[PDB]
């Protein structure tokens, strides 16, 4: 019984929620709030612990990007601080390879990072690795075949359809085939050996479209679109289906969670979050 955990997010201000969804019975758990509110974070899991990485606290008193790494233990229902990153990273992307967390891109005020750093939980230390070829905020990250892909985003001037691949053993990045569509703030994940990029913002509108990358054919193909157009959506994969959570549709902050079934190539409404929000961090344990 693994749960879908959603941390933080934004509606009127950054949020402190930690909620978990159990797909096998439809139930939502209300778990311990984050110590500091944050939106534009990413979530991931190492060792059955949930990590909240980066983001920003957009509050009525003002706006502060986060270099924070916090760790939630589902056994104790408690958040514990970890070593902070080298730099704050709002609108960050994250991936895990061999039990190490990669923090990719993101912003600190006006600085759009190309830099990438790696956390080792066993030593509680971050270290920089080779930077990306492109500065990317609002970037999606997927891990596939022990390689890390950085997909789309915004480089400070252009919104991106480009994507790139990081080779940990070699410590190098290479550009891959660009997507069909410019996307920042998309949900990017891996399912059944393909990278999926769902939604985002193309410079003009929120998107419902979804495309997937086949690493051997080197081509992106559109699949069924989502039921809602969404940017700043959370994403994860649970039992062979993609789950997308919240986001901003151009007018409203959505509470909709939808599910992609790769067998039928369809999306379905599965549940609603307790309140609409965007810019959450999501992970499954
Ligand atoms: C009226 C819409 O207001 C908001 C306010 C805050 C958020 S948020 O979720 O807390 N912040 C973020 C904000 C944004 C930009 C905003 C303010 O929408 C991100 N990037 S983005 O969605 O690529 C995006 C969306 C729309 C844009 O044009 C005008 C509204 C530009 C870029 C994000 C990408 C990933 C994660 C978080 C993002 C999202 C929307």
Residue numbers in the entry: 325 to 609
Kindly provide excerpts from the paper associated with this entry:
Phosphorylated p62 binds with high affinity to Keap1 (Kelch-like ECH-associated protein 1), an adaptor of the ubiquitin ligase complex for Nrf2 (nuclear factor erythroid 2-related factor 2). This binding inhibits Keap1-driven ubiquitination of Nrf2 and subsequently results in stabilization of Nrf2, which then translocates into the nucleus to induce the transcription of numerous cytoprotective genes encoding antioxidant proteins, detoxifying enzymes and multidrug transporters. The DLGex- and ETGE-binding motifs in the Neh2 domain of Nrf2 bind individually to the same binding pocket at the bottom surface of the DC (double glycine repeat and C-terminal region) domain of Keap1 (refs 36, 37), which forms a β-propeller structure composed of six blades. One Nrf2 molecule binds to each Keap1 homodimer; this interaction is crucial for rapid ubiquitination of Nrf2.
After screening 155,000 compounds, we identified one with the desired activity: N-[2-acetonyl-4-(4-ethoxybenzenesulfonylamino)naphthalene-1-yl]-4-ethoxybenzenesulfonamide, which we named K67. X-ray crystal structural analysis of the complex between Keap1-DC and K67 revealed that like Cpd16, K67 binds to a pocket surrounded by basic amino-acid residues at the bottom of the β-propeller structure. The conformation of K67 reveals that the naphthalene ring fits into a pore formed by Gly364, Arg415, Gly509 and Ala556. The benzene ring of one ethoxybenzene moiety interacts with Tyr525 (pi-stacking) and Arg483 (hydrophobic contact), and forms hydrogen bonding with Ser508. Although the benzene ring and ethoxy group of the other ethoxybenzene moiety interact with Tyr334, Tyr572 and Phe577, sulfonyl oxygen between naphthalene ring and ethoxybenzene moiety interacts with Ser363, Ser602 and Gly603. In addition, water-mediated hydrogen bonds are formed between K67 and the side chains of Ser555 and Arg415. Next, to investigate the interaction mode of DLGex and K67 or Cpd16 in the Keap1 pocket, we constructed a model of the Keap1-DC–K67–DLGex complex by superposition of the Keap1-DC from the Keap1-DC–K67 and Keap1-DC–DLGex structures. The model illustrates the coexistence of DLGex and K67 in the Keap1-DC (Nrf2-binding) pocket. A hydrogen bond is formed between the carboxyl oxygen of DLGex peptide Ser33 and the ethoxy oxygen from K67, and Gln26, Asp27, Asp29, Leu30 and Val32 of DLGex and the ethoxy carbons of K67 engage in hydrophobic interactions. The unique feature of K67, distinct from those of other Keap1-interacting compounds such as Cpd16, is that it can inhibit the interaction between phosphorylated p62 and Keap1 without exerting any effect on the interaction between Nrf2 and Keap1.
